[model samples]
Target: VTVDQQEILNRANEVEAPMADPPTDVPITPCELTAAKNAAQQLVLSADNMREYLAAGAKERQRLATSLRNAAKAYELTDTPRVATAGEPNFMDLKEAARKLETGDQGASLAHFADGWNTFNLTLQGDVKRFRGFDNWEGDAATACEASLDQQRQWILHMAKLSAAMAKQAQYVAQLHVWARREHPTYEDIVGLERLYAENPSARDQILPVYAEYQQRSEKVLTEYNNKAALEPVNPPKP
Candidate 1:
């Protein structure tokens, strides 16, 4: 069959563009948001974990002071044995003991745990900076109204940074869990570690509870994190 030039040109020139459409049927789920949310929460929880761990150490210091005072009263020990001096707390000593218990080497464990603690503290403290996105922009009603979008966008970026921090914290937790699980696995160890400190001549009373708290907190946080993860959305989908 013979075709006209104009018709041939028209057929050859035909082109169709696919329309961009908003995703339908597939709903945004809790999982889609969890990566960012969990990242922020992980940092927050890590910081909280550190604080609680440090507080437990503080309690040990108090117990040690009391024990020293009692010993001073009974045996008239010089200047109450100078127990509970500030900084490093008695927790460092208990960390040493816990390390010795796990690795059979007191010196190595002390150094290992101390380095881990110092690294975690510095990392978690830096993690707190991720919250600064809440104040990036400000203005009148319309611009102010968009503040939420701005905040969320900033938050998403912040979460990216937080995720990295959480990863580091998790490593520290793994390293520290050895000592925590060994001596402070049961519920009784959680509280008794401090009480025993006041009673024992050698025990320092901080390591057990701190590790106990971190382990429990990490378990819960990781659970929530995984649950949220299951609902996240895939960026690209099959047609």
Candidate 2:
């Protein structure tokens, strides 16, 4: 079941019922709330960075796998479009590949964040919505394609490492859902329903709307990344 901070993303039967109706009696700080609103906006904007990092990593992994797949294909093997993203064959060699593809071949590789450097953050409240993405996976993502298996293997390994990182973020978001109940005994339900007479009074409808956007994007990145993982190449030992 998909549960967002507001619990609206999932169905009612999918979630546990709140013990008490939400509380509107609690304090509501305009300044704090406004700050929160802006903070939420910032989080969503950070998605641009998240997408970039994911795209870069996905591209790198696909390239590595494609290279291996190419070898297999050359050996007269048939398969699906298993090569998700093979970067470039070589730095100096790119000119011809690019020329063949009819793209500009500057004969140079582009840089991406370094290895062991890509990361996504979670908020103190355990929400992935506050998460930020960053990376430093070493010089030249394009150049890495031409790396030896030993070097290329590192990219595959890094992709595997990110699988765990993604899991941690998912877990953190799950914990946040639990924490929300304890944190707000009132507004524990939906933002509008009264606890006794109203429904989730404190959650504020605005909060749900904002967080929903982030949650959806985050999940997409995560699922796509995992799908990409399953397709990564398992290269044979070299002499």
Candidate 3:
């Protein structure tokens, strides 16, 4: 919504009310007061006008949501269904999906979703860019458009990153659950703790709160990595 829309609803509760109460300093010209009072009908009229405009906007939003759901569902029922991997989505898959999307006479709905992505991936106020295509020529334009799409390309990976790390993290959590389920944890049950720590090294401290408390064995595993990790900062900082 624009400032114009806001100003349309910017009404005085009582446009005919006195401009001020017991004012001693400020001057109020007769015309000034008259002009203010004249707005009484304008406020009364604009209030209903704002509602009319808002109702139209609300209806537009409802229809858009239905269209969006149509597109979201249409993609779900394709020959090349969304088979998300633990990494990024290949441009190959995306292009094939785009093709299948159009083939099913869902072009309008796909365009609608493309418009949604284009706006959401906006770079600046006016620098709206198109959604990336996988076709060679059109895909070249994605770079020519200077969309910083490497980051967009990484969006799926970032989503996958969190899930990937969480799964590994949960394995150690499983160690605890396995430890509890049995009378005691086997060496195999605890082996994944250090391996997960090494694999997800940056998440070490976050992984700390869980593993650090499982008696001496968890601490030893963490300490090995902590010592190994400490070497880098300590060695790099020295003269």
Candidate 4:
């Protein structure tokens, strides 16, 4: 018999027998109250557990952002030096400062920081790749995720600025070779050109920008070459 029909038939039989209903003023039983209390306790514990899980998730999200920020700061882009804010860092300035450590201890510090930043960046990229959807996240969790994404965006800008500086420096070097090859008639003349670049302020002001243009042009050619190379199929060598 189905439970519903059985229950109805049992109720009908009870009514036919004229059995009196239980008194409304029946005394509370300990067993019934304890069972009800235990059920309520379970619910409270479940709510508390949910809160704890959320707290852990939020904490981890914030921690990742903090780590990213610290790593970005540690490897902060080094600005090129200039007499005026608008002035660019010249080749000589960059050459002098490229990898110089002020002290022996500083060298170790620089290496450690460099290594840390590189590892952090790789880790951050992996995390970003795996970032699927989060559900039931409250406002704080959402805010924390946004902050970390913002930090990543800022770091990308920093890297672009750094790349531009390097490009400028590279252009200077390439131009030096080009100038030496074109203008210097003899070995002595080439050496003399190097000294002129090192010593003459007027020459630097005139020549640096010209070389920067050369680097920009070369970069375009190189980028295109790489793209074409990637499209070409690689053939296996004959065994």
Candidate 5:
């Protein structure tokens, strides 16, 4: 509720209390005072009902937050990879789940962070998640907003770099598997290729050119994405 609503409710309760009992020194007749007392009863009932209604809504949000948290956990277990490998569909699903949880309740961000890619220890804020559910800091508004924006900017840039690097690494691993499987392609062949590469870097030099091309492409995309992302607006905190 807004501060205005809080003030209004306080005044409403105060008014009803004074009307509930008239002073003996006041020059009010019995009939006039009786009507005031009856209205006071009604006002009190209305205020109580309003409070109960707000409480019910808050409880509903709490229930929904719990449900979303559970769903996110299930996704993390079954869908999301326990490692930082790329090309998994579960990453998108996990992001969507986090978005839904945030839509339901702001506090659900803790659940989002927990079940997010951070679960694999890949997130930048993995350590910060330890303070989940703590009361929000009540510091200076502008300073806080600036700090939040700076943190977000850093997170976006770093995560993008990390993601690009990991994705390129996964591609290289897959290529290595394929390159090693040149023969009847047994596990032994793959192991043998690793031995060859370990013994002679020249053995994998042919693949290096192709890997370099992919790396160049990945770096270009990361740069473009970050450039666009940095231009996005940040809303300042209101007093």
Candidate 6:
């Protein structure tokens, strides 16, 4: 399911439901001339956003999990008593392992996230029992905490699938950037026009119309790629 799910690209979606639908809503600002300037710049910016979001997903997840780990660890000194329930969460280990995904040829890193997930979940089973030992830990707290943890897991699962899709989209935009750059080259000078046009304006006319013809090259690549792409469910259909 994991491997198969990863094949689903964001471009393939029948109905893209992004917070901001770029194709429909985002307009290239700062004059119409911007379009002739390789709107492929837009493609690159979009790719960067996808990668950064994926990283923020990791950074923030660790921050929240660390808070929980730190508080529980703190309980040892503040309340007194120990049973070796305090592990560092090994976030550094996890992050570095993820980096090694390419360096380590994916097997180790994939195993790190996969087996590491199971390993942590195994600890969680024990943590639940450990938390139950506390006098303050009521039945409702246990159930609620369990549900909340599962909710976090649920969110991560959804993100994992989406990240797979965005991974493909990011690369496609990057590839599109390469081709679009070659196609839509804005000749600010219009193939050596500055001096001649400066001397005599009407003779060259900046060749704006000729450059204008290629303005939509980037747009067509995205449109065609997405148009030909297939769709997959982000989450379960029919709820």
Q: Per-model C-alpha lDDT, please?
A: 0.33, 0.29, 0.28, 0.32, 0.30, 0.32
Residue pairs in clash, model 5? none
By TM-score, is 1 or 6 better? 6
The per-candidate count of clashes, in order, stands at 3, 22, 0, 0, 0, 2
Query: Tens digit of lDDT per residue, candidate 2, span 128-190?
Result: 121111122223432332343234335434434543443333333323323322332122232
Best by TM-score: 6
Spell out the clash pairs found in candidate 4: none
- TM-score of each candidate? 0.22, 0.25, 0.20, 0.26, 0.22, 0.28
- Please give the RMSD to the true structure for each candidate, in Å: 28.3, 27.8, 30.2, 30.5, 28.7, 21.3
lDDT of 6 by residue, 91-116 (tens): 22222222221121212222232333
Backbone clashes in model 1, listed as residue pairs = 31-231, 31-232, 32-232
Query: Which one wins on lDDT?
Result: 1
> The CA-based lDDT of model 5 is what?
0.30
Pairs with backbone N, CA or C atoms under 3 Å apart (clashes), candidate 3: none
Q: How close is candidate 3 to the true structure, as a TM-score?
A: 0.20
Q: What's the candidate order when arranged by decreasing lDDT? A: 1, 6, 4, 5, 2, 3
Q: Order of all candidates by TM-score, from best down to worst?
A: 6, 4, 2, 1, 5, 3
Position 90, candidate 4: lDDT: 22
Encode model 5's per-residue lDDT on 174-203: one tens digit a residue: 232223223112334334545666787765
Across 1-239, the per-residue lDDT of candidate 3 in tens digits comes to 11222211121111111211111111111111112112222222322332233243334334433433343343311121121112221122222222221232212222332233233224211221222322322333224322432332243233223223322322332232223223322344345666788899799998776554444443333333222211110000000
Candidate 3 vs candidate 6: the lDDT winner is 6
lDDT by residue (tens digit), candidate 4, 1-239: 11233322332232123211211111111111122122223322322332233243334445554543443343311222221111222222221221111111212222332233344334433333223222333255445544554554344334333323322322332333333234323334334555777898778877677546544443343333223211111111110
Give Cα distance to truth, residue 219, candidate 6, Å. Answer: 12
* Model 2 weakest 10-residue run by lDDT: 106-115
Off by over 4 Å in 5: 1-139, 183-239
Worst 10 residues of 5 by lDDT: 19-28
